[PDB]
Amino acid sequence: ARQCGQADYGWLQARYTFSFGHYFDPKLLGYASLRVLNQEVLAPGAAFQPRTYPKVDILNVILDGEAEYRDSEGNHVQASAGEALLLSTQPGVSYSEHNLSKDKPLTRMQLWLDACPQRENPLIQKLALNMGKQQLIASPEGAMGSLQLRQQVWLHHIVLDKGESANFQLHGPRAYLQSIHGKFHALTHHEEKAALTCGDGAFIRDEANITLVADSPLRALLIDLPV
Ligand SMILES: [Cl-]
Ligand SMILES: [Cl-]
Numbered sequence: 001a002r003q004c005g006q007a008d009y010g011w012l013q014a015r016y017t018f019s020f021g022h023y024f025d026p027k028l029l030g031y032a033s034l035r036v037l038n039q040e041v042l043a044p045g046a047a048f049q050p051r052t053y054p055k056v057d058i059l060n061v062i063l064d065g066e067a068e069y070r071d072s073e074g075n076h077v078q079a080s081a082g083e084a085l086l087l088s089t090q091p092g093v094s095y096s097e098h099n100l101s102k103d104k105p106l107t108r109m110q111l112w113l114d115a116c117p118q119r120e121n122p123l124i125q126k127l128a129l130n131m132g133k134q135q136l137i138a139s140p141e142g143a144m145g146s147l148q149l150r151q152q153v154w155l156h157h158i159v160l161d162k163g164e165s166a167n168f169q170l171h172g173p174r175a176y177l178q179s180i181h182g183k184f185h186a187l188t189h190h191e192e193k194a195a196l197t198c199g200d201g202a203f204i205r206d207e208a209n210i211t212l213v214a215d216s217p218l219r220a221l222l223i224d225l226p227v
Pocket of ligand 1 (some may be wrong): 031151
């Protein structure tokens with residue numbers, strides 16, 4: 001009962017969870033998949049109960065409000081709207097997420113990627129979203145000032161006006177597109193491949209180049225996936 005498309009007015013109130021499987025390919029061994037993509041809203045004062053995670057790293061993109069993230073080992077970080085946070089989680093450690101406001105709610109999008117826990121990676125990283133047409137916000141080596149992932153994944157944040165476009169060269173054989181707000185379509189080889197309404201996702205296979213075109217004011221993600 002989210003209305004779309006031009007204003008997509010209540011996007012910050014939307015709550016949903018995608019849960020996806022783990023891909024295998026005999027020619028691409030041991031690589032990670034996108035396992036969850038969710039958007040959640042926490043009420044003023046509210047706070048999820050601590051939880052362990054199943055061999056995944058967690059990337060949060062704060063859309064509205066502010067939150068604090070704590071773990072059972074004493075590590076802590078706060079994130080406000082406009083920031084992305086990566087938690088490279090550790091076996092048997094519990095993690096909590098609290099809304100810092102007693103007055104105002106919190107909205108955030110969260111991705112889980114499979115992780116090889118023995119791979120080195122900083123426990124906590126944050127990145128300030130620049131909000132330009134496209135930004136690389138996470139990558140294997142933290143190229144171009146991006147969050148460093150211990151997966152072979154490149155994550156892009158897209159902000160376009162209606163009718164604007166952005167082109168992407170893909171490293172892996174799989175891409176996932178996500179509408180954060182607004183509608184858009186993807187082209188490959190100058191031909192339409194998929195059209196996404198507000199809040200849609202779409203996996204796209206074996207395209208080395210993808211062009212995204214906004215059909216209303218848009219915020220989106222494009223995830224370049226290794227298998
Ligand atoms: Cl990987
Ligand atoms: Cl496809």
